[PDB]
Amino acid sequence: MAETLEKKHERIMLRFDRAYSPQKEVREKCIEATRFARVPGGQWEGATAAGTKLDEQFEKYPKFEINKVATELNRIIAEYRNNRITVKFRPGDREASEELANKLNGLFRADYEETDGGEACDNAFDDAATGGFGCFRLTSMLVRQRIAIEPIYDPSRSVWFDPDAKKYDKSDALWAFCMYSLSPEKYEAEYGKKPPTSLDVTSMTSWEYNWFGADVIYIAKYYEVRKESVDVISYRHPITGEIATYDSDQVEDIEDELAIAGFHEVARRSVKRRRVYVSVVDGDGFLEKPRRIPGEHIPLIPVYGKRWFIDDIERVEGHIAKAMDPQRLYNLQVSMLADTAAQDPG
Amino acid sequence: HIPLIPVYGKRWFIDDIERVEGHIAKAMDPQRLYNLQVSMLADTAAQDPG
Amino acid sequence: QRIAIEPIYDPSRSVWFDPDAKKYDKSDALWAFCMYSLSPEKYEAEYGKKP
Amino acid sequence: MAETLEKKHERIMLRFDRAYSPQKEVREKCIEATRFARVPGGQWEGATAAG
Amino acid sequence: SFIYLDNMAKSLKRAGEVWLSMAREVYGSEREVRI
Amino acid sequence: SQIVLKKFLPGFMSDLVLAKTVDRQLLAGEINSSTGDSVSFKRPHQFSSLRTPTGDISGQNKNNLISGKATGRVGNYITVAVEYQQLEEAIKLNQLEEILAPVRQRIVTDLETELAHFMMNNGALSLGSPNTPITKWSDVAQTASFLKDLGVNEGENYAVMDPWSAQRLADAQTGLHASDQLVRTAWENAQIPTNFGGIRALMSNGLASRTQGAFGGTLTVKTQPTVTYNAVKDSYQFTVTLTGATASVTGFLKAGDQVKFTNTYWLQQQTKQALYNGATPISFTATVTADANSDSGGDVTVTLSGVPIYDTTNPQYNSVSRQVEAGDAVSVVGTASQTMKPNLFYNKFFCGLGSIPLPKLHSIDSAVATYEGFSIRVHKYADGDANVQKMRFDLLPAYVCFNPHMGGQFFGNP
Amino acid sequence: NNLDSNVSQIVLKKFLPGFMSDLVLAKTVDRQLLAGEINSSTGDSVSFKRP
Amino acid sequence: HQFSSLRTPTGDISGQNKNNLISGKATGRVGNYITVAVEYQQLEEAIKLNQLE
Amino acid sequence: DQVKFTNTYWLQQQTKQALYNGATPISFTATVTADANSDSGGDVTVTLSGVPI
């Protein structure tokens, strides 16, 4: 039953390991594809330092790079950004359907415009088209309460889902992860200076890349869905409609209804409901204790370029993976032509 | 807000670092190789006229 | 009082942002820098010759 | 609490150092690209004196 | 040039938002009162 | 035997508590290009009163105004340099960054060993017999009790103990009778709380060690020293000669030994009254600063940090019950030549620590690496055309000792 | 060589902390009975009765 | 790697010594196969072997 | 089997200062890797893992 937070922590760690084990190589391919397509020097990684003594020196082999695999991807990105798309609500065959739909897509449009919806969509589509996996988040912020759209950076190494979820939208997911990097100064700015920093281990980066700063700390948010027993109160005010069932989170004392326009009536019906909790964890303990978010689904929305289910593991592809070998062979051919031509001029 | 407004040509977030690129980065090697080829042709041509 | 628009020269070696900011427009930035060059005569004209 | 301005100054210096540290090898590429495209002698730079 | 123009447009949007936030304390708040 | 992993194997490293606990506030950005290589801080003033029954005595013997200083300066360079064939190094090492990780550690580890030696060499107060380790609660509580008895309030006190010694305190804590939180924490993590007995306790594996140094004979003072405030108002150091020693021994007194004067006791620095340690008064102690030899006839001249001022014309600055005079009986703590790792206790305003920024060498490529607030300047050059490239790392520290009478060493007592 | 005349030997205007004590007896002794009793008319001393 | 430091009042390292890059490697090897083998007849399969899994 | 060298002490690997468990320094220990045999004269040659460099 694990009353202590300590006993719940190693369960979270085990779940993270179980989720990380299978989906390890596909994300490696996605990261390699993005790095190959965008990083200025990423087309020769894995052989950055290669050469022979040449009589008391160690000349490195000449390695040139002519990027030709990004034009078609840029064309795709331009085609998308020319005609953006957004969720549209359609009415039904009722008397108030049109007005309901108008209010719904007015409120949704306001939320999308007064927040980072455009940034989230652009980044998600860019990552999906380049590597194959993209995501963005849909959380709630207070400014009294509102719903905000936020982007996710490094989805390939930052988003991990339940291994038993096989749908495109991960509807049958029971828990989920969202990792992000942080700086130590902000680490003591938030939380506390008292406990030393500890970061989750993934052995993911430094994979054929230069690293200079060990000043990054990996912190993960963790989402669960739980079925719990909750009792509701059915107010039966005769005036302004009689039947109105509300949960026990709002009470005549919690919110000052004062039974002015509300009657107790029946308040014994308890039903099981689906609720979602969020928390912030690290490699040692709980940074923030679990708290329930106002929703029913995991607020993570994954975006895929091409996705298939081949052997008990989902596999993704973008638009760069298929052209790696001809490009990295063309570069070698160009280099071996250039040095040989320069060897003997006349 | 901070009144600094950045403008990026092409921008991405790859490995915990913001990366930017314009329109000259990709074609540096072909140009700086073409120049060398032209020079090594010119000097060889000037060497022996007839 | 009035709001004005001014340019920044050499952004790549003059503009630096908070390393923990990750957005395109850097909304989530807590501090920033803006460097520029100056001549000794102008540095004396403003401020003072004392320092 | 950073009572004195001298106490406030080295915090600013440290923040400048922390901001300059990560974003270094990208601005070099940007400056190199600008110099290569615009400066009359920038396409052969780095090997000006070779013989 | 489409990507450069799009990035410029989305930077101009942010600049306009900053100007909107700035203008309230300089030019004052706006009220609609004529009746 | 050819497939070699690109990921390095794990290594070893110590911890940092001294640099974090010492005062890094006063000595910061003050040794600039204009102040020189040293700078001094001021010292508080003290006054003494008169007891007379008359009022129209407007002309009498008044007090005096003497101003003191505490001067801090810069230390030697912390330099690590490697010579190597850069091509052979770069065969399999990208950007030469594998070197960076175990180097910042050596520079950071060495500064901490230097701070410990200075704190041990300049600290004055001593407690307990060096032979006995720390086993109980009183061994830790005594430092806080003594610091409170001296009269220091402004600041916060600290103590650092070896890891094996803490295992013992946690074992004792597991024996409590009513604090279930404490018992559970000690049983699970073997972790003592933050404030232990009125002083903040720290556990650290990286800590300096010292040797006693051979000595023998009933030592005693030969010539009366001068301990007036005018003489010792700038350093709190004084020199003294001792007789009755061994014939001729090299290294007679090492740096860090505690010499105890039997008949001179400490005073409560405000009320100027003696100190009672439950059953016996507390005697005055001083710390050897530099190594002292012994010549024929058994005469040793030594310099000690911590002064027992008994000025007779400026009584307001006294810090001892009586004046040290010829024929007094002195002793030294510990045994002949044993080696030990001392355990330290100190106030916030005892020793400082500062860094001097270093400018870039002309026409030589370089970089700056930050590591918990310490900036290391790295330079690279290729002098000589034998493919011998060289890289160097530099850091320049600076130390100051404010008041030697607010810190020192302590051990366990039976 | 010999740059010592360029620099100055300064002393910061900040005092190091010192030692102080506490007072408990004056707050606990009786003071209400001997409150202004010794005046110009009374003289050097004044007396109280016994039970 | 492990290194050592030098001390100098001014930083002159003209006549000092400098550290070298000594490389050390730890080796790992394979062991021996673990093999479990069984055999049996087709007639036994037909008339006697049930619940083989 | 485990062999203890009485008069050689461990070291904190980074600091290089000796290790003391209270008032008794810790003694270096090593482990026998292969079976050894004793010949006449009380001489045995052994191979130990972990070295006192």
Which candidate from G7, G17, G18 shows the least CB-CB separation from F34?
G7
**Contact at CB, C32 and B2, closer than 8 angstroms:** yes
- What is each CA distance from A211 to A208, A217, F100, F367, H21, in whole angstroms? 10, 14, 11, 15, 21
Our CA-based measurement puts residue G7 at a distance from the nearest CA of chain F, in whole angstroms, of 5
DSSP 8-class letter at F23:
B
Mutate: best of C2, C17, C25, C28, partner E, most E CBs <10 A = C25
CA I42 to chain centre: 20
**Contact at CB, A51 and F91, closer than 8 angstroms:** yes
Which candidate from C1, C3, C25 shows the least CB-CB separation from E14?
C25
> Do F400 and F71 meet the contact criterion of CB atoms below 8 Å apart?
yes
- Which of chain C's residues have a Cβ under 8 Å away from the Cβ of A116? 23
Long-range contacts of A172-175 (CB under 8 A, 24+ apart): A173/A225, A173/A298, A174/A224, A174/A225, A175/A15, A175/A222, A175/A223, A175/A224, A175/A225
What is the end-to-end Cα distance of chain I in Å, rounded?
21
Q: Is F278 on the interface with D (CB under 8 A)?
A: no
Q: Is F30 on the interface with H (CB under 8 A)?
A: no
Q: Which residues from D are below 8 Å from B when comparing CB atoms?
A: 22-23, 26, 29-30, 33-34, 36-37, 43-44
Q: Which residue of E has its CA nearest to A119?
A: E10
Q: How many CB atoms lie within 10 A of CB F317?
A: 22
Beta bridge partners of A306: A317
Residues in chain A: 346
Rounded Cα–Cα distance for residues F222 and F299 (Å): 8
Q: How many CB atoms lie within 10 A of CB D4?
A: 8
Alpha helix ranges (H) inside F30-159? 86-90, 101-122, 138-150
Element (H, E) at D15: helix D5-20
**Contact at CB, B1 and C27, closer than 8 angstroms:** yes
Q: Which two tokens stand for residue A128?
A: 């999906």
Question: Which one, of F296, F305, F227, lies nearest residue F259 by Cα?
Answer: F305
Cβ-based neighbours of B41, under 8 Å, separated by 6 or more: none
Beta bridge partners of C33: C16
Mutate: best of A75, A77, A81, A115, partner E, most E CBs <10 A = A81
- Which of chain C's residues have a Cβ under 8 Å away from the Cβ of E23? 3
Question: Which one, of F296, F206, F304, lies nearest residue F253 by Cα?
Answer: F304
Beta bridge partners of F330: F261
Rounded Cα–Cα distance for residues F147 and F282 (Å): 13
- Which of chain D's residues have a Cβ under 8 Å away from the Cβ of F29? 6, 9-10
Dihedral over alpha carbons F95, F101, F103, F107 (to 10 degrees): 130
Q: How many CB atoms lie within 10 A of CB F268?
A: 15
Mutate: best of B15, B31, B34, partner A, most A CBs <10 A = B15
Rounded Cα–Cα distance for residues A71 and A77 (Å): 10
Task: Give the E-state strand segments of F33-116 in sequence order.
Answer: 38-42, 69-74, 80-84
**Contact at CB, D33 and B20, closer than 8 angstroms:** no
- Which of chain D's residues have a Cβ under 8 Å away from the Cβ of B28? 33, 36
Rounded Cα–Cα distance for residues F236 and F238 (Å): 7
| DSSP helix, strand, coil percent of chain A (3-state; round to 5) | 30, 25, 45
The chains in contact with chain H, meaning 3 or more Cβ pairs closer than 8 Å, are F
> Do A66 and B29 meet the contact criterion of CB atoms below 8 Å apart?
yes
Rounded Cα–Cα distance for residues A259 and A256 (Å): 8
Beta bridge partners of A134: A303
Rounded Cα–Cα distance for residues A229 and A220 (Å): 28
Look up tokens 């040095």; give the residue.
A339
Question: Which one, of F127, F276, B1, D6, lies nearest residue G13 by Cα?
Answer: D6
Task: Give the E-state strand segments of B1-50 in sequence order.
Answer: 10-13, 18-21
- Which of chain B's residues have a Cβ under 8 Å away from the Cβ of E8? 7
> Do A60 and A49 meet the contact criterion of CB atoms below 8 Å apart?
yes
- Which of chain D's residues have a Cβ under 8 Å away from the Cβ of A185? 18
Local structure of A132: helix, strand or coil: coil
> What is the residue-wise DSSP string for E11-34?
HHHHHHHHHHHHHHHHH-------
**Contact at CB, B19 and A39, closer than 8 angstroms:** yes
Q: Which residue of E has its CA nearest to B22?
A: E4
**Contact at CB, B6 and C27, closer than 8 angstroms:** no
Q: Is G43 on the interface with F (CB under 8 A)?
A: no
Helices A71-82, A117-130: inter-axial angle, 10-degree rounding: 150
Rounded Cα–Cα distance for residues F10 and F397 (Å): 29
Rounded Cα–Cα distance for residues F89 and F97 (Å): 11
| DSSP helix, strand, coil percent of chain G (3-state; round to 5) | 0, 10, 90
CA H20 to chain centre: 27
Q: Which residue of F has its CA nearest to H29?
A: F1
The number of C-beta contacts closer than 8 angstroms across B and C is 21
The number of C-beta contacts closer than 8 angstroms across C and E is 11
